[PDB]
């Protein structure tokens, strides 16, 4: 009814420990969600065009041309790690657990409140807010996944990460098909590169509406909505990283001479000439057996063209890579391709008291060593006459195409049947948790944006809207915009995310890396004197595991 609550606030994470080292981690997340009535009650097909920016030669990477259907609905998205765990919970998970499973998801809307705003004609602004007890909130659960999948974490538009801070839903929109051509150029190109937007292909048109595709529930102040429990079928997520490169696979060479005194200058020596050694190599025309030429079971990681942009029907897009750059751990400035960069606002980890539109940014460096150091790569002749001469070796400094800033590694691909790689680690708090699998016939082996992928399906998107609150002067025949009473809603969203995790075991004599609070990061986890909070990112795959 009007004066009866329809739900309870719960934001507790429970760790129920099972037998055999397994734990059920049920994270509860409760938020107060504020929603305004849509700017327009219609669906719009809006073409965003920034040909001015890309008309500058060399700016083709800044292309934003696209077409989107803007809908009157808003999306309630909780597909981010920060929506579910605080730094203490994440510390417990990443320190005491070795693998993580995604078990189930539930969400519900309760304690719906709808208020109308009456603004007076007095010259200084003044307004009052009245409860509209008969107003309704339109809630649609796309449990069949009919609507396009538009996760908000990629735009930093999920629910807020603070239980005590009210959050908002994101206005929903989806991509409409378009055709676009953009010939790349550079500073110094003469003429106007081909840069046109060709329109839309009629055979690819797909105009979706929530009304025609999903059942819609009208919730009054005394109503509540529950989606029901959804159960995932994803793969386990490892909370351990691998450190072994191809150089550290298998049996090391026997050292016939060992150091007689400790110290950094004292080295063990194999004691056998490199061309007189025993072993197996894939180089059938050389007698040298070294750490770089000896046979290994397979290849850890792969090389791909980095900062390569491929053009397709809808324009250019960067070629993704599964693994981050090698050497970003020895030198943090080397983080670039494959090291995801997260930019977020005050709702999602940035200092809440900051002013301005500049977001808080961080580049994530994974502990796994599956990356590549292209500056140390090279190609050489099949003859393999050592030491190699100039014409028989292609080095990373050799120009490709006549460009001194482009080398073969930029266009180099080593993906093959022997490539072995890991899934992307969870990124806390701004990383996505689960992502829908592509509906293609042949599917990618992994996604670079979420550690869990939906093989069959994952829970339907939740859409909310303020039902039209018409005045007495509504005329559907009029071409002017619908006249509505200014209405807004505040409702409580509660979600339950259930994981299954395995407790880690100590395999080595030495201790391992753990996340800990210290003097440097001590104040990143507590509020300031005025209430300013923040959530800094945390690494997940802290403990190491042996690859081979």
């Amino acid at each position, epitope marked *: 009814g009007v004066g009866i609550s329809t739900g309870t606030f719960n934001n507790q994470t429970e760790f129920k420990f099972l037998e055999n080292g397994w734990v059920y981690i049920t994270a509860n997340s409760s938020r107060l969600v504020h929603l305004n009535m849509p700017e327009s009650e219609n669906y719009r097909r809006v073409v965003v065009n920034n040909l001015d920016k890309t008309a500058v030669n060399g700016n083709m990477a800044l292309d934003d041309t696209h077409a989107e259907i803007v809908t009157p609905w808003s999306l309630v998205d909780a597909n981010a790690w920060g929506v579910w765990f605080n730094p203490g919970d994440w510390q417990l998970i990443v320190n005491t657990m070795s693998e993580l499973h995604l078990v189930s998801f539930e969400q519900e809307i309760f304690n719906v409140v709808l208020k109308t705003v009456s603004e007076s004609a007095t010259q200084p602004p003044t307004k009052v807010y009245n409860n509209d007890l008969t107003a309704s909130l339109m809630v649609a659960l796309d449990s069949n996944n009919t609507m396009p999948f538009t996760p908000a974490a990629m735009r930093s538009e999920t629910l807020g990460f603070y239980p005590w801070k009210p959050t908002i839903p994101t206005p929903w929109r989806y991509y409409f098909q378009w055709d676009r051509t953009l010939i790349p150029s550079h*500073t110094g190109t003469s003429g106007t590169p081909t840069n046109i937007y060709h329109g839309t292909d009629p055979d690819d048109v797909q105009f979706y509406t929530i009304e025609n595709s999903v059942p819609v529930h009208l919730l009054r102040t005394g109503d509540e909505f529950a989606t029901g429990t959804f159960f995932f079928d994803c793969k386990p997520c490892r909370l351990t990283h691998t450190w072994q490169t191809n150089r550290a696979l298998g049996l090391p060479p026997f050292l016939n001479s060992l150091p007689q005194s400790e110290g950094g200058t004292n080295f063990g020596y194999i004691g056998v000439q490199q061309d007189k050694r025993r072993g197996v190599t894939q180089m059938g025309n050389t007698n040298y057996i070294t750490e770089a030429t000896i046979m290994r079971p397979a290849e850890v990681g792969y090389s791909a063209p980095y900062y390569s942009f491929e053009a397709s029907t809808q324009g250019p897009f960067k070629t993704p890579i599964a693994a981050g750059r090698g050497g970003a751990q020895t*030198d*943090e*400035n080397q983080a670039a391709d494959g090291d995801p960069r997260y930019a977020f606002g005050r709702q999602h980890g940035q200092k809440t008291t900051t002013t301005g539109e500049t977001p808080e940014r961080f580049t994530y460096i994974a502990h796994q060593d599956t990356g590549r150091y292209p500056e140390g790569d090279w190609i050489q002749n099949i003859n393999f006459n050592l030491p190699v001469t100039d014409d028989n070796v292609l*080095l990373p400094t050799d*120009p490709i195409g006549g460009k001194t*800033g482009i080398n073969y590694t930029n266009i180099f691909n080593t993906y093959g049947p022997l490539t072995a790689l890991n899934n992307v680690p969870p990124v806390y708090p701004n990383g996505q948790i689960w992502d829908k699998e592509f509906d293609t016939d042949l599917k990618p082996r992994l996604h670079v944006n979420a550690p869990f992928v939906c093989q069959n399906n994952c829970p339907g998107q939740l859409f909310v809207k303020v039902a039209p609150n018409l005045t007495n002067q509504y005329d559907p025949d009029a071409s002017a915009n619908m006249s509505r009473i200014v209405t807004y809603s505040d409702f409580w969203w509660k979600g339950k995310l259930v994981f299954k995790a395995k407790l880690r075991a100590s395999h080595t004599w030495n201790p391992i890396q753990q996340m800990s609070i210290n003097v440097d990061n001590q104040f990143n986890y507590v509020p300031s004197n005025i209430g300013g909070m923040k959530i800094v990112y945390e690494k997940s795959q802290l403990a190491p595991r042996k690859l081979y």
Partner: antibody
Amino acid sequence: EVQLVESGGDLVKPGGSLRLSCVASGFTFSSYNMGWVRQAPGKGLQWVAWIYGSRSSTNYADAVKGRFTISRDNAKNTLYLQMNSLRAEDTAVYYCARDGGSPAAYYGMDYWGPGTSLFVSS
Amino acid sequence: QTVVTQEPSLSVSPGGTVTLTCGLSSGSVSTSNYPGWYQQTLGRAPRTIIYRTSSRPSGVPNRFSGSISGNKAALTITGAQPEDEADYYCSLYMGSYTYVFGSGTQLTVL
């Protein structure tokens, strides 16, 4: 945009010490390898010191090894060159140098400061 | 010790083409040396003309071109202007993290 300003150059007797300070602006200081070059009065440019990497690894020319120390403070966006046991041969204009390639270094001085003169004389 | 040799002095008429060369007494210069060319005027700090043997910083006129000729680095000025008269210094990346500088070439526009 990218600006480097050197200071601390002054007349000093042989065998003394002096710290040149280089203030950088218009760019992320910690993301670029920095260095100190020097030009003797009427002579050509000579590389003095280089600081590179997120670990602040340092390399020095043979003429200043053991005597010069190159360091950086990214909080202040400052580059420090501390010279000890200064000689008359160290008298010159010292230029701040910034490499423009953060993830792929140019291995060359992209930006230069106005320079600070250091005179070593008894 | 590494020694970089370049022409002590060079001359070019206005609107002409001149080439300054930078070699090594022992060895050859390649793109692995990342040859850099810097311009210095009287009483002013050096200005970067070329980096990575081909790249001129934004604002550098197109009349300056960097290349690798033979076993040396070459800086070619085509249509040389009066303001191009200055001392041009060549920097070679000598591996590891060591840099070497040439003696310098005094280019005067007649």
